Point group: C7
Chain length 83, copies 7
């Protein structure tokens, strides 16, 4: 799952499911033991923000040919884990 994209501060980067999302990266300021990579959760569309796919960002591919969707949100917006 690891690509070149990391969450900073109190943010968390998730990956949308084929909004159900999976934790991909947890910012270093998110309190320890808050959640873990791989954890599935649910966030309202209005609470998360789409993040450009690292390939598009690293100028390799075009948005259209990217299937995986990365989103971000502050950790305080996460209410649960299906864990």
């Amino acid at each position: 799952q690891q690509l070149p994209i990391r969450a900073v501060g109190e943010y968390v980067i998730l990956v949308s499911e084929p909004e159900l999302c999976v934790v991909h990266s947890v910012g270093p300021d998110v309190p320890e033991g808050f959640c873990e990579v791989g954890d599935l959760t649910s966030l309202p569309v209005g609470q998360i923000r789409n993040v450009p796919h690292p390939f598009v960002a690293l100028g390799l591919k075009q948005p259209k040919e990217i299937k995986q969707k990365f989103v971000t949100c502050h950790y305080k917006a996460i209410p649960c884990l299906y864990k």
Copy 2:
């Protein structure tokens, strides 16, 4: 009542009654002794947010075939318990 869904931070996950709700899970940051699982309370529709049922989240079932409704809200939005 325990399914694979837990509240994090200062949130609380309730289950709507057949808005009258029952505490299902209390975030680890909610002050100790605030409330207990099983406790019944009332919250204005505008204060709570619907949470996808863990089966829908874990991709097992379809929303339509789920009867139980999970909602979440910050603990400070809870004013009372019918306890």
Copy 3:
């Protein structure tokens, strides 16, 4: 006056007069000596929120057959007591 409904945190639960209200329950976080149960006060309709009657909440009765009206508000919204 005691029914199965208690105020939590910094909230206060009052009962509307036949908005003139009477303190019914004071949250454990309301500063000590702020007010007392039985105290009469006045709050603008816009500052308080209606709370479902514990019987309706505990599924015993129907809203229509309930005369007593419970409301809630944060303690900082209370400016005086007719004490």
Copy 4:
């Protein structure tokens, strides 16, 4: 001037002049030496809130037959005293 109405917390209860108002009661949380009962001040209508007269509150009289007007506001909204 003392009727059964007291200011709580950081609020202050004034009485409108026949908005020019006179301090009637100072909440226990208003910093000591902020103002004194009897002090005259001026507040914009939008900063203060009307408070039901204690007789109306204590169900003795009707609003119409009350001449004295009580209002409230947070102490930080008070900029001066005509003292």
Copy 5:
């Protein structure tokens, strides 16, 4: 310049020039050495609030026959002194 009107808390009372204003009174909570009475400054109309002239407040005169205009604002809204 001293009339019966004083600034409280973090407020400052100025007198509009015949918005160019002159400091008339500095609230006791305004940090020491912030400004001095007599100091001229400039504030946007939207940052200040008109204060009833102490004579009108003390019921001596009518607004129309008052030429001096008193205004108030929080000290943090003051950016400079023409000193």
Copy 6:
């Protein structure tokens, strides 16, 4: 460049270029080593506020005959220096 106008608190007074501006005065509460007088910077028109020229303020001249434009803004609105 020094005229009779100084910045107070956390504000900074700049002078618009013939929005490109030059620091003219730094409030005593702006953290030490934040910037220096003479420093050129850029601020969005919406972040700054026009300040009356000290001559207009000190009632010497008319706005129309003033070419130099003074503006102010909180130091936290300054992102860079062309230094």
Copy 7:
């Protein structure tokens, strides 16, 4: 990449890619180890603000003949690095 423009406080100055951006300068108040110059990231257009190119600011060139686009944003608005 170094031109005469530096980020102050908790801001960060980036350079838009030919919104994908590259860190050009990190304010001295941005927590140590937050990011590094040269790091690529993605920010929503609404979170960043355009900054005048230092040449335009230093009055050398005209906006039209500048290709490089500098933008700024608070460090807390940065969720990831394609690092």
